[PDB]
Symmetry: C3
Subunit: 525 residues, 3 copies
């Protein structure tokens, strides 16, 4: 019954991330990884820091081995109104409450925005609640030893841009192979079930000859989903009802001015039929268009993409990917687990690429270390529920980036903002597992308030130009009960504007992203 | 593309309340109101104070222009047992915790009721948690300068009896027209959609000739629901599964003793097949029967109503109204929004008449002021959810007034209390959006407790003669674990009974409702 | 119109428990109990103490009248791994927080288990959070006058093993009959509804002759469910989707060494196709096999059971019962209420036998004392909701005892642990009324935490060898955010191990269960 041996099929980031984690955190396991000899930049979340910490990986050691750079924020260019306007979702555990009204809490920024519009445009919300914003905005970095950047923790509030394949190659050479992971070179061609009615793999077939025996098979074969989707036949739920993007093209561009260009951030540039990601690495920029075939041809999207990239557009080698934008109905089916794109994928607008991967890895390590590799159907059902809940949460969050945009300038954006219904279940009599659309609507229109329970939504709807109270006369009328006054907002305004001007001056004395990497991590170029 | 111009169809309270609010709080809007030249008293909630404050309306200015009087409570005569018994739902932000046991909180009154029944009949719950109750009970009023009436704020804890048509006429002359609302006299006869697939109104037609162009059309046509219901074809969900009342008749009665009769309160008198509202105005009493055609004829209901009104019943002119007791499945459909009875209506047992109106107005003003009139489908879906949730909440609350009655003396009351199932979805496997029936049942029978989360339910089930713990031996047994004691209830009893006797004495030194109105608002 | 008179059909524990409660707490009621002359041991919860306290019943008076003994814990032998391993669910109002990390709360024991495995095996969770555990473990009892056993209250944290029939006979003679409950000897043969459309009983028929008139009819007829199930036709929802056990056999075994054997606890011994209960009474041990006919024959289950009982297995008289393992879709239908097995039943793995009974009795007493016997449809619908919610909760809790076992040694245990899907609704878009499976899965795999909201689940999954954080490196990494340290766990370990060794020494000076009963009760 017990999982004693594991066969991982696939050797990308997902394969070696799984092999490394299992080899280090589950030493009781015998592990093999099957990789086909005969066969690109990505940004991470805060979540990634937990994975790195669990594997004892120091920035100094692994970052140079995969052209990694630092990431302090996701930047949204052209998303609100399609006129080059910018807003950040900076990394942070919690909103800095330092300049908040005692009585208005999180709603303080919105009242400032109503009273003093010229001083508090949408891009000021992030600055007003998160100082990581300043590092991102002026492309600077610091370990913040003396806490001179408020409520910023370098280790945990800074994530990474990585070459995922080289990251895998690092985990392979340094963690997996040394810990006795058996590297098997071969193509998985077929499988044998245990019996007509027992749908567990008895073994999988390598090169139409060799049978690989394992207690648990892990599918790290990406969009193919060879073991979970094909062999075990698990259905695929697409996200096409709230997310229109079903295609991606990707490319590598050389740096023109490497020091200036190697940004502290993943930029997301909204286009006519989707958005383009910008991922600075040590040696190059990784960039791609996520678009909707519903609204644009492959040829038209590529002409768009090249035009958008300028001179570096013309000779850029572009690779088209068919993206499984959705999830399998289950991650763990019989004696096979989907880890990475074999299970699920959200377009990386919230740098969610590796989420499907390290979440499932940590949840697998959790169950295997529970009772020496013994697991019940109840726990596997729990694994499926936990990781299903998560990808549904994140897919709704990503959908909100489109839903609240002001853009109606193309049929794509007219669909996203004016036609698509994001709350179809909301008029029914039953409470939804995924109810953030309903709850946000209640809090904003119903109660005229934000809440720290919006962890992330607040930065997105702020950047799209929404406020908890849309007009000041509304705020005024709520003070009238207990004969209160807003005059102290004049002091919050003056004091904060002063704090901003001096915070920018201090942040300009800090090393640039490139300088920090050169001096602290690389020691070179 | 953004809402720059608005066409409101319908005058009345709803039409002019919408025109005034939009004209003042959304100055960027071009506004027109279409009213058909060829064509009553009602009570408000606390909610109404927010509306008045948003429009800067001072009591001195608007009250005399629409025969308005003050309202401190909803009074329920004849609802528990059908024997003239009375209980109040007084206005208040929160339950006054002053005489509550630290350990029993809200359940203090119930334990007093069990221990000292003669001293704590059902009508004492309201007195014990809200002092506004005393103003309502002795027909007195005060601005409470020095806070000598505990936890009462005159501005916000006092609502109003108004003539709704004259209130609209005030908003028209003083706010809407001055702020450039374009008054168009005409009958809306038809409409033209934008295209085969675009179901937005391209324009609406006036007198089968003139096309009115607007970015957004607001339906204030009342029960007709001409734009939302008829033209946009939005379905109607009736409340007939929990609320039986589908008819109203209404009348105007002259005062016999105006000073004595012009009450601080909306009285709701339960009858054989529904209930009669009493709304004191400056110059008259507004009164009507809400009834169920399922259980009584129009002529039987009218004979009932006239008998109930006494001598003034005989010559009273009575106007019969067909009430759309329910909601459209959506308020905002394409480029048309329902505001008022065009969207929804709950019989005014909880003075909820204007709720469907000022809630939707405030939620519309909120979205229009967000990004200069630009709104997403997500926000309109949010608007529909918010205002649907609210009318479902309030319709359940109103249903609870019937459900928990002791009355089984007519087939109507036998249906309300013994036959109607108010919790049909509750035995299924899924959690309901509307779960107050389920939650109250769990709190009372399951956990033997009330909660401040029952904001309002507590006054109603208290008045119907329910307690969180139905018998004292139950309370006794829960203290027995850690050898704890109730002896201090003797002191809560004596101290409170003293506080009541002296509170009535103070309240009797205050001006009467009529005196207050005469001296502070009118000057007759 | 209001409940003035009540007819209880059935005279077991359920019948007389109902008659006694109503007669004492609802004096306004006229009460009759109909019992069939030709119709001829169980453990309780803490909740039973509330019932006893409501009826003013002192241990000294009622315990000897029904061969009652004391019960401080449910013990689970052979349930984790099928190798004689034991863990307790001891009685307690709350988890004792005395040795908990301020920052880790309930997760403290789990971190100790990871750091110091040899010192904190699964059986130590109960010891670490509940001292009642020590009384149960060393078969001792005390009134704890000086609170020398932390967070233990003798009156409320000690329940009972009772002969349920003799308990009913006591309530009959001492409370019900003296309070004027009218005892009617007869077989209920039929009924007449009020009209085509009014489905209320107008009366029920006794011996095909006599009509019994009552405002409210209470069905205490057990699995028969004559009034609720048969006459009112209320459907039965079985629990076979989560609980495989559909059969029970039961027996009486004499004591070999009564002093040593008369345990402080209900033992639940997991077998090949179910589990055997051990209920010590004053004069005998009551014992039975709950099993699944799906996985084992009646003859095979009985051979199993006799073998398990040893020498006194061979001559033991065994009584086979067909158990209605489920609930009626409603308890209160028209003017008839199901109380006891007529409404619902969970196999007594969580000593839940009397739950279906005293909870419905207390909920009925609650509504009747509200407005002098007047009740609305809303209140009756509320009664149905409350008592439906409860039996669904408890049936899920009982299912968790199987679901999380390590046993795969028979097809029965392979089914319970590796095949049965306990969370079928969980992948849907709607939130479930019953979502403890979903919420426990989220708390453990999702958030790597336990919660006091698991009141009881924690003892079961702890005993099955599960931890909130499964490995220590995971704990380490979560401290790293807010620069926190675990150093102080060395002191929690040493301090607690000291407290345990001295707690065992003190508990050994206390009287044994038998000594306590002999000196205090008999």
């Amino acid at each position: 019954v017990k999982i004693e041996s594991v066969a991982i099929v696939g050797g990308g980031s997902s394969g070696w991330m799984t092999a490394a984690a299992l080899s280090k955190l589950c030493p009781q396991l015998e592990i093999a990884l099957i990789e086909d000899p005969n066969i690109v930049g990505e940004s991470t979340l805060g979540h990634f820091n937990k994975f790195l910490h669990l594997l004892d990986l120091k920035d100094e050691d692994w970052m140079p081995a995969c052209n990694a750079t630092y990431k302090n924020s996701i930047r949204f260019t052209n998303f609100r109104e399609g006129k080059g306007e910018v807003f950040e979702y900076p990394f942070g555990p919690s909103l800095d409450v330092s300049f908040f009204s005692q009585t208005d809490g999180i709603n303080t920024w919105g009242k400032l925005a109503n009273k003093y519009p010229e001083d508090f445009p949408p891009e000021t919300f992030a600055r007003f609640v998160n100082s990581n914003t300043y590092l991102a905005e002026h492309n600077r970095l610091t370990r913040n030893k003396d806490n001179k950047i408020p409520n910023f923790n370098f280790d945990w509030d800074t994530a990474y841009h990585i070459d995922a394949e080289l990251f895998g190659q690092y985990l392979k050479e340094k963690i997996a192979l040394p810990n006795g992971v058996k590297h098997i070179q071969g193509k998985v061609t077929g499988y044998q079930k245990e019996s007509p009615n027992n749908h567990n793999f008895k073994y999988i077939i390598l090169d139409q000859e060799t049978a690989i025996f394992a207690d648990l098979y892990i599918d790290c074969t990406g969009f193919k989903s060879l073991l979970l989707g094909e062999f075990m036949g698990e259905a695929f739920s697409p996200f096409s009802k709230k997310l229109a993007n079903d295609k991606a093209m990707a490319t590598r561009i050389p740096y023109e001015n490497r020091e200036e260009e190697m940004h502290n951030v993943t930029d997301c540039h909204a286009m006519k039929n989707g958005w383009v990601w910008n991922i600075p690495l040590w040696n190059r920029i990784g960039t791609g268009y996520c678009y909707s075939s519903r609204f644009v041809s492959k040829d038209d999207a590529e002409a768009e993409f090249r035009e958008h990239l300028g001179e570096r557009g013309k000779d850029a080698k572009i690779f088209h990917i068919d993206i499984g934008h959705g999830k399998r109905t289950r991650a763990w089916v019989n004696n096979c687990v989907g880890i990475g794109l074999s299970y699920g994928f959200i377009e990386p607008l919230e740098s969610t690429g590796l989420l499907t991967t390290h979440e499932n890895i940590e949840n697998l390590v959790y169950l295997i270390n529970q009772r020496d590799g013994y697991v019940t159907q109840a726990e596997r059902d729990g694994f499926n529920y936990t990781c299903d809940h998560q990808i549904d949460s994140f897919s709704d969050f990503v959908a909100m980036h489109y839903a609240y945009s002001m853009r109606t300038d193309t049929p794509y954006w007219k669909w996203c903002t004016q036609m698509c219904n994001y709350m179809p279940e909301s008029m029914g009599p039953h409470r939804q597992k995924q109810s953030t659309w309903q709850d946000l609507s209640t809090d904003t229109i119903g109660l005229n308030t934000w809440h720290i329970n919006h962890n992330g939504i607040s930065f997105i709807i702020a950047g799209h130009g929404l406020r908890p109270q849309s007009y000041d006369k509304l705020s005024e009328v709520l003070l009238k009960r207990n004969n209160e006054s807003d005059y102290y907002y004049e002091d919050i305004r003056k004091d904060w504007l002063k704090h901003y001007e001096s915070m920018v001056e201090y942040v300009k004395t800090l090393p640039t992203h490139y300088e920090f990497l050169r001096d602290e991590i690389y020691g070179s170029a």
